[PDB]
Scaffold this motif. Structure first.
Motif, PDB file in Angstrom:
ATOM      1  N   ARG A  89       0.825  -1.296   0.103  1.00 25.53           N
ATOM      2  CA  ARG A  89      -0.040  -0.144  -0.067  1.00 25.53           C
ATOM      3  C   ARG A  89       0.742   1.286  -0.167  1.00 25.53           C
ATOM      4  N   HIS A  90       2.055   1.041   0.634  1.00 24.13           N
ATOM      5  CA  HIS A  90       2.834   2.304   0.872  1.00 24.13           C
ATOM      6  C   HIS A  90       3.924   2.785  -0.256  1.00 24.13           C
ATOM      7  N   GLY A  91       3.711   1.652  -1.354  1.00 23.33           N
ATOM      8  CA  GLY A  91       4.657   1.831  -2.648  1.00 23.33           C
ATOM      9  C   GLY A  91       5.806   0.970  -2.579  1.00 23.33           C
ATOM     10  N   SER A 133       3.513   2.943  14.805  1.00 22.83           N
ATOM     11  CA  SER A 133       2.652   1.744  14.421  1.00 22.83           C
ATOM     12  C   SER A 133       2.273   1.735  12.983  1.00 22.83           C
ATOM     13  N   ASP A 134       2.218   3.069  12.601  1.00 21.31           N
ATOM     14  CA  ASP A 134       1.947   3.485  11.044  1.00 21.31           C
ATOM     15  C   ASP A 134       3.542   3.638  10.606  1.00 21.31           C
ATOM     16  N   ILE A 135       3.676   2.774   9.402  1.00 22.45           N
ATOM     17  CA  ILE A 135       5.016   2.753   8.782  1.00 22.45           C
ATOM     18  C   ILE A 135       5.522   3.641   7.829  1.00 22.45           C
ATOM     19  N   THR A 136       4.683   4.693   7.700  1.00 24.20           N
ATOM     20  CA  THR A 136       4.754   5.912   6.652  1.00 24.20           C
ATOM     21  C   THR A 136       6.146   6.411   6.605  1.00 24.20           C
TER      22      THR A 136
HETATM   23 ZN   LIG Z   1      -0.071   2.237   6.248  1.00 23.40          ZN
END
Ligand SMILES: [Zn+2]
Ligand SMILES: [Cl-]
Ligand SMILES: [Zn+2]
Ligand SMILES: [Zn+2]
Length: 129
Positions: free
Chosen positions: A14-16, A86-89
């Protein structure tokens, strides 16, 4: 947060990261497994005094600021603590800059020693991506 194998594969996609700079998703999942065992809160001190942060163990020597690594840079322009979310952005965005630095995924020693040349497809096998 400790991600499940397929859960992280999905998040990375999802994050590319799927095929980012030519590296299939399996490479990224494999790297994360051996760097942090899928734990976003992992931190580890390096011999040079810098520290590795997050799921992809990004170091403070060049990529983030932790205020305690003399002579270091903050090329991803982020506080190292942002790499523990917890958000891997943050980790993904910085990983994209690191993998583009010239040496590809060899930037991650663990990837070179434990993923490179292996069947990395096994890391996303069975996952509905
Ligand atoms: Zn994410
Ligand atoms: Cl290693
Ligand atoms: Zn699972
Ligand atoms: Zn490291």
């Amino acid at each position: 947060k400790v991600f499940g194998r397929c859960e992280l594969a999905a998040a990375m996609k999802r994050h590319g990261l799927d095929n980012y700079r030519g590296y299939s998703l399996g490479n990224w999942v494999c790297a994360a497994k051996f760097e942090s065992n899928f734990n976003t809160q992992a931190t580890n001190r390096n011999t040079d005094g810098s520290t590795d942060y997050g799921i992809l163990q990004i170091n403070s020597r060049w990529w983030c600021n932790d205020g305690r690594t003399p002579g270091s840079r903050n090329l991803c322009n982020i506080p190292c603590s942002a790499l523990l979310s917890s958000d891997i952005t943050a980790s993904v965005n910085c990983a994209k800059k690191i993998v583009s630095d010239g040496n590809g995924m060899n930037a991650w020693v663990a990837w070179r020693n434990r993923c490179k040349g292996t069947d990395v497809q096994a890391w996303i096998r069975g996952c509905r991506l």
